[PDB]
Design a protein around this ligand. Structure first.
Ligand code: HEM
Ligand code: HEM
Ligand SMILES: Clc1cccc(CCCNCCc2ccnc(-n3ccnc3)n2)c1
Ligand SMILES: Clc1cccc(CCCNCCc2ccnc(-n3ccnc3)n2)c1
Ligand SMILES: C[C@H](O)[C@H](O)[C@H]1CNc2nc(N)[nH]c(=O)c2N1
Ligand SMILES: C[C@H](O)[C@H](O)[C@H]1CNc2nc(N)[nH]c(=O)c2N1
Ligand SMILES: [Zn+2]
Lengths: 407, 411
């Protein structure tokens, strides 16, 4: 019940007590582990609020104080009256920072307390949502010197008036299925690229077409909006060794911004809460570029490197993979856009783990996601045992809006 | 209940029913997942149900469930248990048992091969010298001049736990490790403690970088004894790189036979604490873990130096770059010398097919994603994209404490 996690490269043992505050369920049982599975009322509300406010007030060293008790009563009064309640700006910022802190799949959490929270709860329309998003995009990009940020639209009321950003990321490339049977652009977005067109988008059918924003306010039908190109910073991908690499016509966007997730704070649900940080190199080079169901460019690059692709045992796929990722990091660094390599990031995460064990008694972490999709065992986190569990406040997944939207 | 796993690269969805037959525990709960934790004497009371459950499986597999042969055997085992407090497995049951424990090894990527396992019955063994003889025959059969064959040798089961057979080596063939006075390590750092024991037990160490450890064998609860595996039985491969001619000059070699000797085989409640088994290597075992782990030979630096890599910033990915070449050299060398080896693409791809087959014919395939995914180039192998369920079936291979911590020394 007081658990220990061992790093097998350094012999460091940390003790975990934080897990004994976990409330939500993992998907696992004593008989079966689901660690690699991607997704395993008024009375409901107040204990949730209470748990949150207790944490908040303990974090500011006024646990059980006047203000604490006062606030507890105040919220309690509001819930009974209004069937919900509103967070104070202080609570909102704290909630959001702690949702990031608790996100067991994010490797970048050492930065957690340096989050810029944009309070967009006064927003009422999609145009409004568009304005708030552009401001977020411009602020976070910061001419290439990325700053972490989140923008928080109004909380769910009766699930009929939900704010949603339909895009999965604020900035993604389009996906077109060809008569050819092949697929142009990003295949992860083929369906989303479709719905953009069904609602009205004038697709230019290219390889790297920046998708439009598709914003839903107050439960209404969603609306399309083109992000000003001058706000979308992009990096052309070249290789500091292969002059031919540029001829591949590869580029990527600099701002990684998750927009499809649900932020839960003290029982309240924020269904539109786009957040952004900066890329770990492998996210683009390994996953976006090399996944079979994505841009899948390994064959092209290997062909261009003139490798023996006759045999898996030549490790040509591995060879190309490295070069590509060298290029990605190179291109971002040369255009002065923030990016972190998988070595630096994981190293920082181990440090963050030590801090969290020390100042908080633990750090929930999902090894399957923290370990980079290349060179796993030459990063420190490979040899680091982790305990995975769900704390609140949290970022949760939520259904794609098209499957739910009452048109 | 039915459970679904999804491959996100192919959208193939599989349904697991097999997990219902799982009794042992995972270490996880509804509130915590211990999926990355490496490591989260038995009365007649608990033994016969275990025996029944095993024999029931056995008889089902041979399509004789409920037969007279089946019922008579259950009867025989029950009577033998209460009379003698234990029981003996038939040769057929032992073979079936050993294969199925490999089959259920959720951390093993090579299980497509599970049904082709040479089982050597060493239950008539009584002494360490007898253990050495058996182990030699294993090494020679499995090696087969480089055309490797999977094999397991099974020494007598545990009785009261005071008479255990144990192989003290973690692997039948491994290299010595020596801590120097200056704090550096010569040879394999993972074998420092074990090398020290051997030296203490009387081993005369050449003190080199690749000294094949002697065998330290414990029979019937007695103190362990040292034996040197005949060198001519130890197949080794010099590591060279197909383009880099300076690579040979690193002075690297490895052995061809990968053989786990410190695990415990459970079959029908019986405990076989000495059960060394061998397969063949997936390249990354040597190339990535053996050579490049910081706590192992750790050759990434010297290799990268000689590659003239920009080692000044980690964002040059010099480490990743060296890692690949080293793994290229390992596979190259083994194939050149015609010793069996498999690359991680080939091996993971076969495992996906094996897994799909197991769901269709068996209703499941327990699998530990944290272990199954190779330690380099994870997402360009198909297992990375494969959802897996992990649970514990018997028969099984289990960890057991190192015998130097538990042994009661005679003297
Ligand atoms: C600032 C530098 C950051 C870095 C280097 C970073 C890194 C990562 C990486 C590599 C992933 C894996 C994504 C994938 O493979 O799909 C991830 C996921 C995640 N990150 Fe971050 N992140 C950063 C900032 C943030 C911020 C600002 C937030 C929220 C405030 C956040 C919350 C999350 C969450 C909730 C996930 C899980 C996403 C999912 O489950 O699909 N991260 N992060
Ligand atoms: C024939 C080719 C085989 C291949 C390519 C293979 C592959 C692997 C690999 C890569 C591992 C991970 C080892 C590590 O990273 O520490 C492993 C683990 C394991 N294998 Fe195999 N294996 C083979 C044969 C066998 C055989 C014959 C058996 C048993 C009869 C077996 C049983 C196991 C077990 C029990 C583990 C877990 C080891 C542990 O937890 O330390 N494998 N296998
Ligand atoms: Cl459950 C499940 C099943 C299929 C696909 C999936 C997508 C996971 C994508 N995760 C978001 C990736 C992403 C993209 C841009 N930026 C970030 N990002 C930014 C800061 N932190 C993370 N993260 C989930
Ligand atoms: Cl639980 C835990 C914690 C720290 C170290 C540890 C040792 C893992 C060793 N795994 C076996 C490695 C190995 C070596 C040679 N051969 C094989 N092998 C042969 C057939 N299948 C696997 N496997 C366990
Ligand atoms: C099946 C498996 O759970 C799936 O492929 C996971 C593996 N680990 C991951 N890790 C990260 N960081 N991102 C991912 O999308 C995934 N996908
Ligand atoms: C802490 C972590 O679980 C540990 O380092 C695991 C990770 N995955 C592994 N996978 C394999 N094949 N072998 C290992 O030793 C490990 N080590
Ligand atoms: Zn689990």
């Amino acid at each position: 019940r007081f658990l220990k996690v061992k790093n097998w490269e350094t012999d460091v043992v940390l003790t975990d007590t934080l897990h004994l505050k976990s409330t939500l369920e993992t998907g696992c049982t004593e008989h079966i582990c689901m660690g690699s599975i991607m997704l395993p009322t008024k009375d409901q509300l107040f204990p949730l609020a209470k748990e949150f406010l207790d944490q908040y007030y303990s974090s500011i060293k006024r646990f059980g104080s006047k203000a604490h008790m006062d606030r507890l009563e105040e919220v309690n009064k509001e819930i009974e009256s209004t069937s919900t309640y509103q967070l104070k700006d202080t609570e909102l910022i704290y909630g959001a920072k702690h949702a990031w802190r608790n996100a067991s799949r994010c490797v970048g959490r050492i930065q957690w307390s340096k989050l810029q929270v944009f309070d967009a709860r006064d927003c009422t329309t999609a145009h409004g949502m568009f304005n708030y998003i552009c401001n977020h995009v411009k602020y976070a990009t910061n001419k290439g010197n990325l700053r972490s940020a989140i923008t928080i639209f109004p909380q769910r009321t009766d699930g009929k008036h939900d704010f949603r950003v339909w895009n999965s990321q604020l900035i993604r490339y389009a996906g077109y299925k060809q008569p050819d049977g092949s697929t142009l652009g990003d295949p992860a977005n083929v369906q989303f690229t479709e719905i953009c067109i069904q609602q009205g988008w004038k697709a230019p059918r290219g390889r790297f077409d920046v998708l439009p924003l598709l914003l839903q306010a107050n439960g209404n039908d969603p609306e399309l909006f083109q992000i000003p190109p001058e706000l979308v910073l992009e990096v052309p991908i070249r290789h500091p060794k292969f002059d031919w690499f540029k001829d591949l016509g590869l580029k990527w966007y600099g701002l990684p911004a998750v927009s499809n997730m649900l932020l839960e704070i003290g029982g309240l649900e924020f269904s539109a809460c786009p957040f952004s940080g900066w890329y770990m190199g492998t996210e683009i080079g390994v996953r976006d570029y090399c996944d079979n169901s994505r841009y899948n460019i390994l064959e092209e690059v290997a062909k261009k490197m003139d490798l023996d692709m006759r045999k898996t045992s030549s490790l040509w796929k591995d060879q190309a993979l490295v070069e590509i990722n060298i290029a990605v990091l190179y291109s971002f660094q040369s255009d002065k856009v923030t990016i972190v390599d998988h070595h630096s990031a994981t190293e920082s995460f181990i440090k963050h783990m030590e801090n969290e064990y020390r100042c908080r008694g633990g750090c929930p972490a999902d090894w399957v996601w923290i370990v980079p999709p290349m060179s796993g065992s030459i990063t420190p986190v490979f040899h680091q045992e982790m305990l995975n569990y769900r704390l609140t406040p949290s970022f949760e997944y939520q259904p794609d809006p098209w499957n739910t939207h009452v048109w």
